[PDB]
mmCIF file of C-alpha atoms in Angstrom:
data_model
loop_
_atom_site.group_PDB
_atom_site.id
_atom_site.type_symbol
_atom_site.label_atom_id
_atom_site.label_comp_id
_atom_site.label_asym_id
_atom_site.label_seq_id
_atom_site.Cartn_x
_atom_site.Cartn_y
_atom_site.Cartn_z
ATOM 1 C CA UNK A 3 -16.480 1.961 15.831
ATOM 2 C CA UNK A 4 -18.377 -1.061 14.490
ATOM 3 C CA UNK A 5 -16.872 -3.758 12.255
ATOM 4 C CA UNK A 6 -18.405 -6.569 10.241
ATOM 5 C CA UNK A 7 -17.178 -10.018 11.337
ATOM 6 C CA UNK A 8 -19.418 -12.921 10.214
ATOM 7 C CA UNK A 9 -23.028 -14.023 9.832
ATOM 8 C CA UNK A 10 -25.569 -16.833 9.786
ATOM 9 C CA UNK A 11 -28.702 -17.622 7.777
ATOM 10 C CA UNK A 12 -31.590 -17.207 10.261
ATOM 11 C CA UNK A 13 -34.127 -20.026 10.499
ATOM 12 C CA UNK A 14 -37.395 -19.019 8.800
ATOM 13 C CA UNK A 15 -40.024 -21.521 7.683
ATOM 14 C CA UNK A 16 -41.306 -21.695 4.131
ATOM 15 C CA UNK A 17 -44.951 -20.790 4.895
ATOM 16 C CA UNK A 18 -44.269 -17.893 7.291
ATOM 17 C CA UNK A 19 -44.938 -14.257 6.309
ATOM 18 C CA UNK A 20 -41.981 -13.275 4.142
ATOM 19 C CA UNK A 21 -39.705 -10.676 5.819
ATOM 20 C CA UNK A 22 -39.939 -8.780 2.496
ATOM 21 C CA UNK A 23 -43.392 -7.703 3.721
ATOM 22 C CA UNK A 24 -44.866 -8.968 0.418
ATOM 23 C CA UNK A 25 -47.659 -10.668 2.413
ATOM 24 C CA UNK A 26 -46.956 -13.918 0.532
ATOM 25 C CA UNK A 27 -45.178 -16.882 2.115
ATOM 26 C CA UNK A 28 -41.416 -17.247 2.462
ATOM 27 C CA UNK A 29 -41.404 -19.998 -0.207
ATOM 28 C CA UNK A 30 -43.245 -17.519 -2.501
ATOM 29 C CA UNK A 31 -41.767 -14.035 -1.990
ATOM 30 C CA UNK A 32 -37.944 -14.216 -1.881
ATOM 31 C CA UNK A 33 -37.079 -17.611 -0.343
ATOM 32 C CA UNK A 34 -38.037 -19.942 -3.203
ATOM 33 C CA UNK B 167 -5.656 -10.993 1.156
ATOM 34 C CA UNK B 168 -9.284 -10.328 0.172
ATOM 35 C CA UNK B 169 -8.735 -7.171 -1.749
ATOM 36 C CA UNK B 170 -8.734 -8.828 -5.178
ATOM 37 C CA UNK B 171 -11.438 -11.289 -4.073
ATOM 38 C CA UNK B 172 -13.498 -8.165 -3.342
ATOM 39 C CA UNK B 173 -12.869 -6.355 -6.634
ATOM 40 C CA UNK B 174 -13.475 -9.624 -8.487
ATOM 41 C CA UNK B 175 -16.902 -10.009 -6.860
ATOM 42 C CA UNK B 176 -17.978 -6.663 -8.321
ATOM 43 C CA UNK B 177 -18.031 -7.913 -11.924
ATOM 44 C CA UNK B 178 -20.408 -10.763 -11.118
ATOM 45 C CA UNK B 179 -23.348 -9.241 -9.259
ATOM 46 C CA UNK B 180 -25.911 -6.513 -9.844
ATOM 47 C CA UNK B 181 -27.545 -5.386 -6.596
ATOM 48 C CA UNK B 182 -31.245 -4.579 -6.582
ATOM 49 C CA UNK B 183 -32.184 -3.624 -3.017
ATOM 50 C CA UNK B 184 -31.753 -3.959 0.734
ATOM 51 C CA UNK B 185 -34.495 -4.641 3.280
ATOM 52 C CA UNK B 186 -33.639 -4.706 6.980
ATOM 53 C CA UNK B 187 -36.154 -6.596 9.078
ATOM 54 C CA UNK B 188 -34.373 -7.096 12.437
ATOM 55 C CA UNK B 189 -31.662 -5.264 14.394
ATOM 56 C CA UNK B 190 -30.253 -5.573 17.944
ATOM 57 C CA UNK B 191 -27.140 -4.287 19.670
ATOM 58 C CA UNK B 192 -25.960 -3.558 23.173
ATOM 59 C CA UNK B 193 -23.172 -1.461 24.663
ATOM 60 C CA UNK B 194 -22.306 -4.088 27.265
ATOM 61 C CA UNK B 195 -21.783 -6.786 24.642
ATOM 62 C CA UNK B 196 -19.963 -4.655 22.056
ATOM 63 C CA UNK B 197 -21.975 -6.775 19.644
ATOM 64 C CA UNK B 198 -25.022 -6.403 17.460
ATOM 65 C CA UNK B 199 -26.824 -8.119 14.604
ATOM 66 C CA UNK B 200 -28.630 -7.028 11.425
ATOM 67 C CA UNK B 201 -30.997 -9.359 9.565
ATOM 68 C CA UNK B 202 -31.614 -8.445 5.954
ATOM 69 C CA UNK B 203 -32.734 -9.411 2.453
ATOM 70 C CA UNK B 204 -30.342 -8.266 -0.282
ATOM 71 C CA UNK B 205 -31.720 -8.760 -3.788
ATOM 72 C CA UNK B 206 -29.422 -9.146 -6.762
ATOM 73 C CA UNK B 207 -28.955 -10.610 -10.196
ATOM 74 C CA UNK B 208 -26.034 -12.628 -11.528
ATOM 75 C CA UNK B 209 -25.633 -13.707 -15.160
ATOM 76 C CA UNK B 210 -29.207 -12.541 -15.769
ATOM 77 C CA UNK B 211 -30.884 -14.527 -12.948
ATOM 78 C CA UNK B 212 -32.596 -12.929 -9.942
ATOM 79 C CA UNK B 213 -31.857 -14.227 -6.431
ATOM 80 C CA UNK B 214 -31.951 -13.056 -2.818
ATOM 81 C CA UNK B 215 -29.619 -13.241 0.174
ATOM 82 C CA UNK B 216 -31.278 -13.699 3.553
ATOM 83 C CA UNK B 217 -28.704 -13.289 6.303
ATOM 84 C CA UNK B 218 -28.165 -12.110 9.890
ATOM 85 C CA UNK B 219 -24.771 -10.425 9.966
ATOM 86 C CA UNK B 220 -22.897 -9.921 13.223
ATOM 87 C CA UNK B 221 -20.982 -6.756 13.984
ATOM 88 C CA UNK B 222 -18.757 -5.963 16.917
ATOM 89 C CA UNK B 223 -17.369 -2.748 18.358
ATOM 90 C CA UNK B 224 -13.684 -1.844 18.732
ATOM 91 C CA UNK B 225 -12.558 1.524 20.105
ATOM 92 C CA UNK B 226 -14.192 4.949 20.164
ATOM 93 C CA UNK C 105 -32.663 15.895 -9.657
ATOM 94 C CA UNK C 106 -30.768 14.065 -6.954
ATOM 95 C CA UNK C 107 -29.461 10.893 -5.480
ATOM 96 C CA UNK C 108 -31.460 8.904 -2.934
ATOM 97 C CA UNK C 109 -29.220 6.548 -0.995
ATOM 98 C CA UNK C 110 -28.940 2.987 -2.315
ATOM 99 C CA UNK C 111 -29.415 2.367 1.537
ATOM 100 C CA UNK C 112 -33.046 2.414 0.511
ATOM 101 C CA UNK C 113 -33.511 4.997 3.278
ATOM 102 C CA UNK C 114 -35.011 7.730 1.020
ATOM 103 C CA UNK C 115 -32.319 10.202 2.107
ATOM 104 C CA UNK C 116 -29.781 11.800 -0.190
ATOM 105 C CA UNK C 117 -26.780 9.496 -0.519
ATOM 106 C CA UNK C 118 -24.427 12.270 0.652
ATOM 107 C CA UNK C 119 -26.517 12.564 3.849
ATOM 108 C CA UNK C 120 -27.146 8.802 4.414
ATOM 109 C CA UNK C 121 -24.484 6.196 3.690
ATOM 110 C CA UNK C 122 -22.137 8.629 1.898
ATOM 111 C CA UNK C 123 -21.074 10.468 5.056
ATOM 112 C CA UNK C 124 -19.958 7.142 6.526
ATOM 113 C CA UNK C 125 -18.185 5.829 3.439
ATOM 114 C CA UNK C 126 -16.280 9.120 3.115
ATOM 115 C CA UNK C 127 -14.941 8.842 6.673
ATOM 116 C CA UNK C 128 -16.708 12.038 7.727
ATOM 117 C CA UNK C 129 -19.117 10.323 10.151
ATOM 118 C CA UNK C 130 -18.561 7.302 12.388
ATOM 119 C CA UNK C 131 -21.353 4.772 11.921
ATOM 120 C CA UNK C 132 -23.468 5.038 15.104
ATOM 121 C CA UNK C 133 -24.809 1.467 15.173
ATOM 122 C CA UNK C 134 -24.627 -1.855 13.283
ATOM 123 C CA UNK C 135 -27.693 -1.019 11.166
ATOM 124 C CA UNK C 136 -25.997 2.076 9.755
ATOM 125 C CA UNK C 137 -22.801 0.084 9.180
ATOM 126 C CA UNK C 138 -24.684 -2.647 7.328
ATOM 127 C CA UNK C 139 -26.362 -0.068 5.107
ATOM 128 C CA UNK C 140 -23.040 1.607 4.363
ATOM 129 C CA UNK C 141 -21.336 -1.662 3.392
ATOM 130 C CA UNK C 142 -24.243 -2.533 1.104
ATOM 131 C CA UNK C 143 -23.668 0.855 -0.545
ATOM 132 C CA UNK C 144 -19.955 0.126 -0.929
ATOM 133 C CA UNK C 145 -20.898 -3.112 -2.704
ATOM 134 C CA UNK C 146 -23.265 -1.197 -5.000
ATOM 135 C CA UNK C 147 -20.660 1.540 -5.548
ATOM 136 C CA UNK C 148 -17.805 -0.991 -5.939
ATOM 137 C CA UNK C 149 -15.760 0.761 -3.216
ATOM 138 C CA UNK C 150 -13.382 -2.025 -2.139
ATOM 139 C CA UNK C 151 -11.402 0.238 0.203
ATOM 140 C CA UNK C 152 -14.405 1.063 2.388
ATOM 141 C CA UNK C 153 -15.282 -2.632 2.640
ATOM 142 C CA UNK C 154 -11.745 -3.411 3.735
ATOM 143 C CA UNK C 155 -11.813 -0.571 6.276
ATOM 144 C CA UNK C 156 -15.137 -1.707 7.804
ATOM 145 C CA UNK C 157 -14.106 -5.378 8.062
ATOM 146 C CA UNK C 158 -13.012 -6.433 11.559
ATOM 147 C CA UNK C 159 -9.187 -6.234 11.703
ATOM 148 C CA UNK C 160 -8.641 -9.901 12.607
ATOM 149 C CA UNK C 161 -10.087 -10.950 9.246
ATOM 150 C CA UNK C 162 -7.124 -9.330 7.470
ATOM 151 C CA UNK C 163 -9.298 -7.924 4.666
ATOM 152 C CA UNK C 164 -6.492 -5.850 3.020
#
């Protein structure tokens, strides 16, 4: 059985392809 | 302990979607990770959580 | 008409995250657990969030 414990905010640059898949940059899609 | 913290957090956020973009786990570690974007709105403003949560295995 | 999982998985809720929240199916990996806790936030199910929090955090 799995349990949630903690988390971190992964490092992702502002110009990289947004993980949202929107094609746009990170500082454009969802990481303003 | 948290229980009322948890209920109280319900009134404040409206969730709008979950996108998982990375996932790893391993039996030998009893650990895994899930990276995700969780979109929401609070008091009428859109925002997005980007986070890599860590999970661990106990029993089974 | 029916009820695609707020998972975002395009499965019926009762066959995606709902089986896990109900206690009927153990979550097979961290990705499924993450999805099911996101559902519990959407569905404002504080008891499932408590139950899927690691015991040392004392979520109750």
